[PDB]
Amino acid sequence: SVPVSGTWVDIRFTLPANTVDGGTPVIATEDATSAMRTVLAIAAGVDSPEFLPAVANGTATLTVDWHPERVADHTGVTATFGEPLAPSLTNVPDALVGPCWPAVFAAIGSAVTDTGEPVVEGLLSLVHLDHAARVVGQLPTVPAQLTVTATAANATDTDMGRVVPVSVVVTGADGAVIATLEERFAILGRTGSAELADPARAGGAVSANATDTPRRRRRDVTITAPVDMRPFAVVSGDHNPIHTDRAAALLAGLESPIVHGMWLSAAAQHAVTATDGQARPPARLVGWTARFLGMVRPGDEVDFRVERVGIDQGAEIVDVAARVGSDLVMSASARLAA
Amino acid sequence: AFVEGAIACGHSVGEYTALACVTGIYQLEALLEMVFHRGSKMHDIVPRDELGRSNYRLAAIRPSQIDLDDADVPAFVAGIAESTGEFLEIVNFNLRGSQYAIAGTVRGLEALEAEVERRRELTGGRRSFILVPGIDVPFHSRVLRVGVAEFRRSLDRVMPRDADPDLIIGRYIPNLVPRLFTLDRDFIQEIRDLVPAEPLDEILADYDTWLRERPREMARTVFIELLAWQFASPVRWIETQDLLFIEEAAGGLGVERFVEIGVKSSPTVAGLATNTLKLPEYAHSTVEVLNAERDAAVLFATDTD
Amino acid sequence: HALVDRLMAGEPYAVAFGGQGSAWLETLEELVSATGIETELATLVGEAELLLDPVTDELIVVRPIGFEPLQWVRALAAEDPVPSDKHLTSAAVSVPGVLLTQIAATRALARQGMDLVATPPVAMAGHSQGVLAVEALKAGGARDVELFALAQLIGAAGTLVARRRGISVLGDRPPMVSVTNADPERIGRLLDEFAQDVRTVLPPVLSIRNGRRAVVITGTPEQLSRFELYCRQISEKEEADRKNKVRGGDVFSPVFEPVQVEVGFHTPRLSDGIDIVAGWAEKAGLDVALARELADAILIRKVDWVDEITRVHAAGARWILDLGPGDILTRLTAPVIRGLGIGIVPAATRGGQRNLFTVGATPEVARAWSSYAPTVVRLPDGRVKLSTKF
Amino acid sequence: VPTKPVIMHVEGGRAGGHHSWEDLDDLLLATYSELRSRANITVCVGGGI
């Protein structure tokens, strides 16, 4: 029994007669279901028996209350940049990912492979692999009540791990589609032999008329990762214990917890859309994607080096690459509005 | 490298190309025909000398250090017009601070340069008066109000029947009125009491049944009327630049890039844009001003470092 | 110790409490290292955070590090790395830090041998921040835990509502700009004139009034820079009017300085923060009325330091202690009691303690001006003449 | 010079003869506290009396 964060996780061991002479103990799959569903509750919402949202035939739906000032105190936690810059005035697309966490964790809680379920064998080995956002031109600015719907596809297992793709769509009160998010999750332990399909570049908003104009630098911004993840946890919503708890990080087989993929996602988006007064237009994102590569411990000095890639009917294609020392931790692409 | 829903501005003679190019409300054959007819009809509405001369020149005046502004310049022009006994008019509101254009008769022109040179030797050397190079017709003034009716007839001859009003609504800035082209009772009343428009009074009477009945027809009539009267009405280009540079909050069209399409040997509109930006009413507005020939590399986005 | 000899024998002294933007950490570290009251401060903070048990999540939304001040004091004493300047000057850790500094300074001087309950001060001067501290000393030493938890709520709510609005620091430009060398009524006039045009959306407002020639302005930072451009244009107008040999009386040339606060205070635009503090107070175990009152007093309702200190002088204090962090309150009160003959004394400073304790080292109070008022004499022939020092 | 007494004649701009541009109240509002901080300065004033 492990106290993870306020509550307990029970793992039950069974000992056959094989364990008399060098036999390993076995952990039954239903005991591991119970342990991973209660840590799924600790990740998303209060208790595992029927407080996570119900799974439909394929989907999981939620209706949440949206306020625009929560975007402001989101950016106040995320954007901790240097001196000369300034955050944007329009809202950033990594703010709708906040209220839609119980939908995607409920989708993980019932997502299955081809005859087998990744709820159990890898929830402590869960990594947010990559993220992709596509916005329609609407974005609310009044206090409203919108809804989200997340579908988990049939998970495969490629040469780096078991990939669970999940696609959520967010619509307002009038039935208008606001935005569409697609993200993949890597279960890191178990693998197979299947080809890993590459995700869509710039969130699927490339209009198939793009020329490889030569690269031009835009900005170089150094951002330090914060020490504790509970502020970004309470702001965003994911209480995934791998980012905060020490016992859960040791239980997942890490030396120390890791920062949020959505944290450095939102840091990259603000490094794109920040302003410093000189003669350039502001940035407003339309399509976006970000691939996560390595782990970032809390207290590392990330630096973004944003460049220009292409052009598409007056709007330009812009990528970032984040480094910690001399390797990559993400690679992200974007198509911003004209 | 051409965005789609960008709005259409321009100087009052490139305004025709602003209709034709970035909106496509008509095409370049009718554009070139209309342009040649308005040139040939402008050329023959002034009784001039038989040796080519006239009694009409214009001049760029510079209210710099001589203590003139928006509340003082038209009263100044009317006062020197009453002192001389001639017709003196503003024609081009080019720059807020130090670039105005005055068209009139030659006697009023020497009265203008007399007062400007004596205030110049009062306050310091500025070269505040430059007479126009070459051209000799008082543009956009009251004395051009017969060719506007004949040009209305030629315009109804040239321009096609069916108009799409949404191709210019929220996208067009004329020069006699510096506001967006919008189907408004206030808009048609403003052009009506700015310049008397004899076929517009029936629309000024009623439009609620006519918005129900004749949207394309009514937009077509107000379009040809407002396009015909700028041949004799002065421009309000200072207020167009203010309407383009004042942001969306504190209402006005807040834009990001201001690209003008002209040659690099004389980027005049880009010079006026940079001067209005460096004017001290605002020093923080990041409005990137491009020429389509000086800044070709950064316009087509084919530049390295 | 002749100064406290006179004050404990009884001379009218007032006590003033400091304000914001003062780098409280190093003076609190020096005061703890001088006295040794770390156990009492530790049990104070311990029962305060015990009282703040349910709302730790909504509290930790804001604070990046987490506000453990006494271990920071231990770190600075043992020469360990210190939390950075932004993470110190944010409101949720500053406005409890200065309160803990002032309470520790009062208890430090009470251990040193000056008892405020044995000899009460005459007047109680409270600046911007020090309203809660002057409530804490107007009551006994028995509501310090509730007021410490209340200030620790106030800072988090202030940073939260100010980030929801635009009244926080963006880059280096802060939300408060101090105007010195200017007439405050004229500053109010042209603030209203700068408000009346359409092109501004949020008018910056005048908040406090330090002296007779100094205020500060709180608002959005680009609004502050635009207002500075406006005043610079009027200054260049009157300077050219002097240089071309016209009136030449004076020149409107105010001086702008940034304030080192993270968050604008004393504006009406923080009207939601009082309801946030009311909700957190009713979720916690403390009351709501004095909570809402102090939130009004430190977030919205402006202050007036000039008539505050003239209320002090009308009470008649011939000496004035201040207890606040650093010497900013001394350097702000000197031009306003400059011509009254009242002596300031700093606390929480080694120089202040040696001037407060050494018999041979007492501050030299300058003379009043009613003494320089002239007199009448009679010459020995019966003539009646005037006597000035000339 | 600490012990010797020094006398000021603060003359304004409204005086006859040569014409300073400064104004009297502005001058000694700038400098009155510094004048009274010393103990040996006598301050006579003039200009427009």
Longest CA–CA separation in chain A, Å: 76
Buried b (16+ CB within 10 A) or exposed e, B226-263: bbbbbbbbbbbbbbbbbbbbbeeeeeebebebbbbbbe
Of A92, A329, A71, A121, the residue nearest A225 (C-alpha): A329
- Find the closest chain C residue to B243 by CA distance: C199
Distance from CA of A114 to the nearest CA of C (A): 41
Does chain A touch chain D (at least 3 C-beta pairs within 8 Å)?
A: no
Give the H/E segment covering residue D27. helix D24-37
List the structure tokens of A231. 């502020």
Buried b (16+ CB within 10 A) or exposed e, B88-115: bbbbbbbbbbbbbbbbbbeebbebbbee
Cα–Cα dist B103/B132, whole Å:
9
Residue C91 buriedness (CB in 10 A; 0-12 / 13-18 / 19+): buried
Q: Give the nearest partner residue to A216 out of B3, B257, B303, using CB atoms.
A: B303
- Find the closest chain C residue to A70 by CA distance: C164
Cα–Cα dist C164/A69, whole Å:
5
Residue D49 sits at the chain C interface (C-beta within 8 Å): no
Three-state SS at A18: helix
Q: Give the nearest partner residue to B250 out of C198, C222, C233, using CB atoms.
A: C198
Distance from CA of C196 to the nearest CA of B (A): 12
C224 CB neighbour count, 10 Å cutoff:
21
Buried b (16+ CB within 10 A) or exposed e, B171-184: bbbbbbbbbbbeee
Give the H/E segment covering residue A264. helix A261-273
Residue C253 and residue C241 in contact, taking contact as beta carbons nearer than 8 Å: no
- For B248, list phi and psi in degrees, rounded to 5: -70, -50
Q: Give the nearest partner residue to A231 out of C60, C165, C170, using CB atoms.
A: C60
Instruction: Report CB contact under 8 Å: B303, A308.
Output: no
- Find the closest chain C residue to D20 by CA distance: C248
How far from chain centre, in Å, is Cα A40? 15
Distance from CA of C214 to the nearest CA of D (A): 15
Residue A113 and residue A187 in contact, taking contact as beta carbons nearer than 8 Å: no
Q: Give the nearest partner residue to B4 out of A216, A281, A313, using CB atoms.
A: A313
Walk across the sheet containing B99-104 and list its strands.
B88-95, B99-104, B57-61, B129-131
Instruction: Report CB contact under 8 Å: C229, B246.
Output: no
Q: Give the nearest partner residue to C250 out of D23, D36, D44, using CB atoms.
A: D23
- For A216, list phi and psi in degrees, rounded to 5: -135, 135
Residue B86 and residue B104 in contact, taking contact as beta carbons nearer than 8 Å: yes
Cα–Cα dist B255/B238, whole Å:
16
- B61-to-B77, B269, C317 alpha-carbon distances in Å: 11, 17, 68
Conformation bin of residue A321: beta by default, left when phi > 0, alpha when psi is -120 to 50: beta
Residue B145 buriedness (CB in 10 A; 0-12 / 13-18 / 19+): middle
Cα–Cα dist B107/B114, whole Å:
11
Cα–Cα dist D27/D43, whole Å:
12
Residue C244 sits at the chain B interface (C-beta within 8 Å): no
Q: Angle, nearest 10°, between helix axes A261-273 and A69-78?
A: 100
Q: Residues of C with CB below 8 A from A236's CB? A: none
Q: Counting one residue from A and one from B, how many pairs have CB atoms under 8 Å apart?
A: 40
Q: Which H, E and C letters describe chain C, residue by residue?
A: CHHHHHHHHHCCEEEEECCCCCCHHHHHHHHHHHHCCHHHHHHHHHHHHHHCCCCHHHHHCCCCCCCCHHHHHHHHHCCCCCCCHHHHHCHHHHHHHHHHHHHHHHHHHHHHCCCCCCCCCCCEEECCCCHHHHHHHHCCCCCHHHHHHHHHHHHHHHHHHHHHCCCECCCCCCCEEEEECCCHHHHHHHHHHHHHCCCCCCCCEEEEECCCCEEEEECCHHHHHHHHHHHHHHHHHHHHHHHCCCCCCCCCCCEEEECCCCECCCCHHHCCHHHHHHHHHHHCCCCCHHHHHHHHHHHCCCCCHHHHHHHHHHHCCCEEEECCCCCHHHHHHCCCCCCCCCEEEECCCHHHHHHHHCCCCCCCCCCCCCCCCCEEEECCCCCEEEECCC
Residue C172 sits at the chain A interface (C-beta within 8 Å): yes
Q: Angle, nearest 10°, between helix axes C24-35 and C69-77?
A: 70
> What is the secondary structure of A66-122 as a DSSP string?
E-THHHHHHHHHH----SS-B--SSPPSTTTTSTTHHHHHHHHTT--BTTB-TTTSS
- For C21, list phi and psi in degrees, rounded to 5: 70, 65
CA atoms within 13 A on the CB side of B31: 15
Of A77, A137, A72, the residue nearest A284 (C-alpha): A137
- C340-to-C10, C320, C330, C334, C366 alpha-carbon distances in Å: 20, 12, 15, 10, 8
B16 CB neighbour count, 10 Å cutoff:
19
Of B267, B162, B274, B179, the residue nearest B220 (C-alpha): B162
Q: Angle, nearest 10°, between helix axes C91-112 and C38-51?
A: 140
Cα–Cα dist C211/C389, whole Å:
30
Residue C242 sits at the chain D interface (C-beta within 8 Å): yes
Instruction: Report CB contact under 8 Å: B280, C222.
Output: no
Residue C224 and residue C269 in contact, taking contact as beta carbons nearer than 8 Å: no
User: What value, to the nearest 5°, has the Cα angle with vertex C91 and ends C85 and C97?
Assistant: 80
Q: Is the dihedral of CA B73, B74, B75, B80 positive or negative?
A: positive
Of C44, C33, C80, C261, the residue nearest C168 (C-alpha): C261
B52-56 LR contacts (CB < 8 Å, sep 24+): B53/B136, B54/B136, B54/B137, B55/B105, B55/B106, B56/B103, B56/B104, B56/B105, B56/B106, B56/B136, B56/B137, B56/B138
Q: Counting one residue from B and one from C, how many pairs have CB atoms under 8 Å apart?
A: 13
Residues in chain C: 390
Residue B249 sits at the chain A interface (C-beta within 8 Å): no
Cα–Cα dist C312/C136, whole Å:
19
| Start-to-end C-alpha separation, chain D | 31
Q: Residues of B with CB below 8 A from C222's CB? A: 284
Which DSSP category does D15 fall into?
A: -
Number of H helices, E strands in chain D: 1, 2
What type of residue sits at position A174?
A: D
C300 CB neighbour count, 10 Å cutoff:
16
Q: Is the dihedral of CA B272, B275, B279, B282 positive or negative?
A: positive
Instruction: Report CB contact under 8 Å: C338, D44.
Output: no
Residues 6+ apart with CB under 8 A from B199: B221, B225
Tell me whether strands D6-11 and D41-46 are parallel, antiparallel or unpaired: parallel
Walk across the sheet containing C255-258 and list its strands.
C205-209, C214-218, C176-180, C255-258
- B85-to-B76, B82, B89, B217, B240 alpha-carbon distances in Å: 14, 5, 13, 44, 32
PDB experimental method: cryo-EM
Residues 6+ apart with CB under 8 A from C9: none
Residue A203 and residue A335 in contact, taking contact as beta carbons nearer than 8 Å: yes
Q: Counting one residue from A and one from C, how many pairs have CB atoms under 8 Å apart?
A: 38
Residue A59 and residue A152 in contact, taking contact as beta carbons nearer than 8 Å: no
Residue A152 and residue A108 in contact, taking contact as beta carbons nearer than 8 Å: yes
Residue C364 sits at the chain D interface (C-beta within 8 Å): no
Cα–Cα dist C144/C132, whole Å:
10
Residue C229 sits at the chain B interface (C-beta within 8 Å): yes
Instruction: Report CB contact under 8 Å: C201, B250.
Output: yes
Which DSSP category does A212 fall into?
A: -
- Find the closest chain B residue to C199 by CA distance: B250
Conformation bin of residue D45: beta by default, left when phi > 0, alpha when psi is -120 to 50: beta
Cα–Cα dist D42/A191, whole Å:
96
- Please name the residue that has the structure tokens 């009155």: D32
Instruction: Report CB contact under 8 Å: D22, C248.
Output: yes
Tell me whether strands A301-312 and A2-3 are parallel, antiparallel or unpaired: unpaired
Instruction: Report CB contact under 8 Å: A76, C63.
Output: no
Distance from CA of D23 to the nearest CA of C (A): 6
Which DSSP category does D47 fall into?
A: S
Cα–Cα dist C57/C40, whole Å:
27
Of C341, C339, C329, the residue nearest C305 (C-alpha): C329
- Find the closest chain B residue to C233 by CA distance: B280
Residues 6+ apart with CB under 8 A from C360: none
How far from chain centre, in Å, is Cα C119? 24
Residue B121 sits at the chain A interface (C-beta within 8 Å): no
Cα–Cα dist A128/A296, whole Å:
13
- Find the closest chain B residue to A314 by CA distance: B1
Instruction: Report CB contact under 8 Å: C61, A234.
Output: yes
| Start-to-end C-alpha separation, chain B | 20
Q: List A244's β-bridge partners, or say none.
A: none
Cα–Cα dist C166/C189, whole Å:
24
Residue B112 and residue B61 in contact, taking contact as beta carbons nearer than 8 Å: yes
Of A161, A265, A273, A152, the residue nearest A203 (C-alpha): A265
Buried b (16+ CB within 10 A) or exposed e, D18-49: eeeebbbeebbeeeeeeebeeeeeebeeebee
Cα–Cα dist C47/A239, whole Å:
28
Distance from CA of B119 to the nearest CA of C (A): 16
Q: Give the nearest partner residue to B2 out of A213, A314, A316, using CB atoms.
A: A314
Conformation bin of residue B168: beta by default, left when phi > 0, alpha when psi is -120 to 50: alpha
Cα–Cα dist A242/A258, whole Å:
7
Residue C171 sits at the chain A interface (C-beta within 8 Å): yes
Residue A207 buriedness (CB in 10 A; 0-12 / 13-18 / 19+): exposed
Q: Residues of B with CB below 8 A from A214's CB? A: 302-304
Conformation bin of residue B59: beta by default, left when phi > 0, alpha when psi is -120 to 50: beta
Of B222, B72, B85, B58, the residue nearest B141 (C-alpha): B58
- Please name the residue that has the structure tokens 């202050």: C303
Instruction: Report CB contact under 8 Å: A311, B305.
Output: no
Instruction: Report CB contact under 8 Å: A227, C168.
Output: no
Tell me whether strands C319-322 and C13-17 are parallel, antiparallel or unpaired: parallel
Cα–Cα dist D5/D18, whole Å:
28
Cα–Cα dist A130/C169, whole Å:
33
Residue C164 sits at the chain A interface (C-beta within 8 Å): yes
| Start-to-end C-alpha separation, chain C | 39
Residue A216 and residue A295 in contact, taking contact as beta carbons nearer than 8 Å: no
Q: Residues of A with CB below 8 A from C170's CB? A: 86-87
| Start-to-end C-alpha separation, chain A | 55
Which DSSP category does A308 fall into?
A: E
Does chain C touch chain D (at least 3 C-beta pairs within 8 Å)?
A: yes
Instruction: Report CB contact under 8 Å: C199, B280.
Output: no
Residues 6+ apart with CB under 8 A from B50: none
Residue B122 sits at the chain C interface (C-beta within 8 Å): no
Instruction: Report CB contact under 8 Å: B284, C198.
Output: no
Residue A271 and residue A92 in contact, taking contact as beta carbons nearer than 8 Å: no
Residues in chain A: 338
Q: Residues of B with CB below 8 A from C230's CB? A: none
Instruction: Report CB contact under 8 Å: A76, C168.
Output: yes
Residue C109 and residue C150 in contact, taking contact as beta carbons nearer than 8 Å: no
Q: Give the nearest partner residue to C248 out of D21, D33, D42, using CB atoms.
A: D21
Tell me whether strands C343-346 and C319-322 are parallel, antiparallel or unpaired: parallel
List the structure tokens of C171. 């880059």
Cα–Cα dist B245/B247, whole Å:
6
Of C158, C97, C166, C196, the residue nearest C280 (C-alpha): C158
Instruction: Report CB contact under 8 Å: C249, D23.
Output: yes
C193 CB neighbour count, 10 Å cutoff:
11
- Find the closest chain B residue to A282 by CA distance: B256
Of C149, C117, C178, the residue nearest C52 (C-alpha): C149
Q: Counting one residue from C and one from D, how many pairs have CB atoms under 8 Å apart?
A: 21
Instruction: Report CB contact under 8 Å: C369, D42.
Output: no
Cα–Cα dist A237/A302, whole Å:
23
Residue B179 and residue B7 in contact, taking contact as beta carbons nearer than 8 Å: no
Residues 6+ apart with CB under 8 A from B216: B162, B163, B164, B165
What type of residue sits at position B69?
A: D
Residues 6+ apart with CB under 8 A from A69: C164
Residue B286 sits at the chain C interface (C-beta within 8 Å): no
Cα–Cα dist B243/B227, whole Å:
20
> What is the secondary structure of chain B as a DSSP string?
---SS--B---TTTHHHHHHTTT-SS-HHHHHHHHHHHHHHHTTSS---TTS--S-EEEEE--SSS---TTTHHHHHHHHHHHHTS-EEEEEEEETTTEEEEEE-HHHHHHHHHHHHHHHHHH-----EEE-SS----TTSGGG-SHHHHHHHHHHHHS-S---GGGTTTTB--SSS-S-----HHHHHHHHHHS--TTTHHHHH--HHHHHH-HHHHHHHHHHHHHHGGGTSPP-HHHHHHHHHS-SSSSS---SEEEE---SS--HHHHHHHHHHHSTT-S----EEEETTTTHHHHTT----
